[PDB]
Amino acid sequence: APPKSVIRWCTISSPEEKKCNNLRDLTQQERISLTCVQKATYLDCIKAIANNEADAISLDGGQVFEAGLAPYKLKPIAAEVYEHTEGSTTSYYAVAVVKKGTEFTVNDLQGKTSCHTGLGRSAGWNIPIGTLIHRGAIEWEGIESGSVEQAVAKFFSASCVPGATIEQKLCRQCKGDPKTKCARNAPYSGYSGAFHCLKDGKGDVAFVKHTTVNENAPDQKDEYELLCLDGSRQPVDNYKTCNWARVAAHAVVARDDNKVEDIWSFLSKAQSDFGVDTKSDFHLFGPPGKKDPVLKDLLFKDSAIMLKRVPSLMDSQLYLGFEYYSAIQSMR
Numbered sequence: 487a488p489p490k491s492v493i494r495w496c497t498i499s500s501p502e503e504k505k506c507n508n509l510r511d512l513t514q515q516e517r518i519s520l521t522c523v524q525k526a527t528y529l530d531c532i533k534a535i536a537n538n539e540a541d542a543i544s545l546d547g548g549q550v551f552e553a554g555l556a557p558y559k560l561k562p563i564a565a566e567v568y569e570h571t572e573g574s575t576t577s578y579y580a581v582a583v584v585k586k587g588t589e590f591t592v593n594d595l596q597g598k599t600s601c602h603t604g605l606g607r608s609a610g611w612n613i614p615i616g617t618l619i620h621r622g623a624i625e626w627e628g629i630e631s632g633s634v635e636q637a638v639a640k641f642f643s644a645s646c647v648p649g650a651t652i653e654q655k656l657c658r659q660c661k662g663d664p665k666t667k668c669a670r671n672a673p674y675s676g677y678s679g680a681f682h683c684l685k686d687g688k689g690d691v692a693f694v695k696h697t698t699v700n701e702n703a704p705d706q707k708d709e710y711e712l713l714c715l716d717g718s719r720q721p722v723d724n725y726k727t728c729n730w731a732r733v734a735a736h737a738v739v740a741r742d743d744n745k746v747e748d749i750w751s752f753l754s755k756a757q758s759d760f761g762v763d764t765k766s767d768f769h770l771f772g773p774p775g776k777k778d779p780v781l782k783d784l785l786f787k788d789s790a791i792m793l794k795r796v797p798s799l800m801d802s803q804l805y806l807g808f809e810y811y812s813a814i815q816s817m818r
């Protein structure tokens with residue numbers, strides 16, 4: 487086999503860096519070994535990867551979009567795989583979780599408080615906000631008229647939107663220290679952070695994914711329910727008949743160069759050794775379960791069960807698909 491080499495993973499929080507460096511220690515004698523570099527935000531990681539300071543990061547589809555734009559031009563090389571009733575899938579469902587018995591519908595969201603995974607993320611932002619704009623609930627004639635943040639802050643009374651910087655109302659519901667409560671890696675960030683924002687009474691609704699309630703409250707699951715687009719409420723387990731969209735899996739992105747082979751070699755081996763069937767204490771994926779949300783979705787989502795290599799000919803637009811890609815274009 488070819489000679490040994492190293493890949494540099496870019497992390498977005500100290501818990502992620504710690505997990506990455508645990509994986510480093512466990513892979514140091516492999517042909518492809520690992521180092522870990524932490525940045526303040528995923529965008530710093532995109533920049534670092536485009537500048538050949540790091541090699542890979544897993545991103546939500548909304549950030550896969552950003553990573554593919556000039557001057558970065560990163561492409562997705564591996565997709566997360568989730569459980570499915572048929573076996574497995576490389577997409578997930580965006581849902582709007584509410585507490586059982588609060589009755590209000592999708593048509594009654596004005597003036598509510600809301601919990602989001604992060605600005606510009608699929609389930610947490612692009613899908614719910616784009617949907618509410620399309621329905622005419624959120625009035626927004628396009629970027630030139632004013633920011634999306636401004637329009638959302640006029641609609642919800644207060645929110646937690648990790649990463650929001652234009653509208654202070656979008657940080658009002660966030661938990662944590664002043665300097666970090668509205669950061670993209672804050673306590674209420676991610677699917678699980680947004681769920682805990684709802685659980686804690688800081689939002690009336692959490693814009694999360696189909697596994698989120700089960701990941702965080704498996705024994706209180708049916709104290710929650712879902713807001714359906716048709717105006718109904720349905721059980722958490724009914725997401726296939728009560729979702730806002732199906733969206734492409736989070737993906738590992740990388741430069742369009744030959745380092746992709748080493749990145750995939752490392753990941754292929756790592757998921758064989760540290761995947762759902764591992765003998766180790768270290769799990770590449772999760773595992774899911776009740777615990778503090780800042781421990782969740784580190785490097786990869788806790789709900790991932792494998793990675794599937796993306797064909798080289800797929801870029802970010804093909805990966806996300808033309809329809810969602812164009813939906814994101816219309817919000818910027």
Ligand SMILES: [Fe+3]
Binds near residue numbers: 547607608609736
């Ligand atoms: Fe996502």
